[PDB]
């Protein structure tokens, strides 16, 4: 009875190295909005805060609080949305806008999140979780592809996805509403960039 999103819903986590259409149903997420370079402290803190909350929720089964509707779950891969506002140059990593996200089971409500922030304040006092929010949404119709290799080469994968959209008659909705979406299967701090695996997912209509 432990949820493992990667196994039970593998299609969302294991595309091949070619573009495919995918419909992404409603999911529940912890999210942190932020700005700037992923090498910077703000992004690192965002990721740390998400994991602090997710593991506080998961490990609640070993404490004295029974969360309503609790199910154990394998913490899923980190994901991110990426967009810009105003005139923008890609080389300008400080201008990047993003949201860092972790999927959660349905039982995670605002009340569960508030409880986890309080527990984490005690157990993990150096992590500020105040910007973590809970967002449920249906990402919907997308194209996705596994990108193997450095982030600087993602343009190759994105271009192939764009060509697939043309071939299939799909409109590219990517922008500031339906956002460019990465799912990180590798830890970029520990992985050889040449062998990193990242899902790139772009919304379509
Ligand atoms: C109690 O039990 C547990 C608690 C636990 N916590 C964690 C955990 O915290 N984890 C795992 C892991 C992912 C993670 C993290 C901590 C982190 O601070 C962190 N940073 C990154 C990171 O930096 N990432 C991921 C994305 C990203 C980077 C990165 O380097 C970049 O290069 C600059 C990036 N460039 C770009 C682009 O260019 S996009 C265009 C994107 C991007 C990843 C993680 C694990 C754990 C296990 C437990 O059992």
Numbering used by the authors: 4 to 208
The study reports:
Here, we show an additional level of resistance regarding YTM cyclopropyl hydrolysis catalyzed by a subfamily of GyrI-like proteins exemplified by YtkR7, a gene product coded for within the same biosynthetic gene cluster of 1. We define this subfamily of GyrI-like proteins as cyclopropanoid cyclopropyl hydrolases (CCHs), and demonstrate that they share a conserved aromatic cage for the hydrolysis of 1 and 2, and thereby confer cellular protection. The GyrI-like proteins possess a duplicate βαββ configuration and appear to have been adapted for small-molecule binding. To probe the catalytic mechanism of CCHs, we carried out co-crystallography and molecular dynamics (MD) simulation experiments on lin2189, a CCH protein from Listeria innocua that can hydrolyze both 1 and 2.
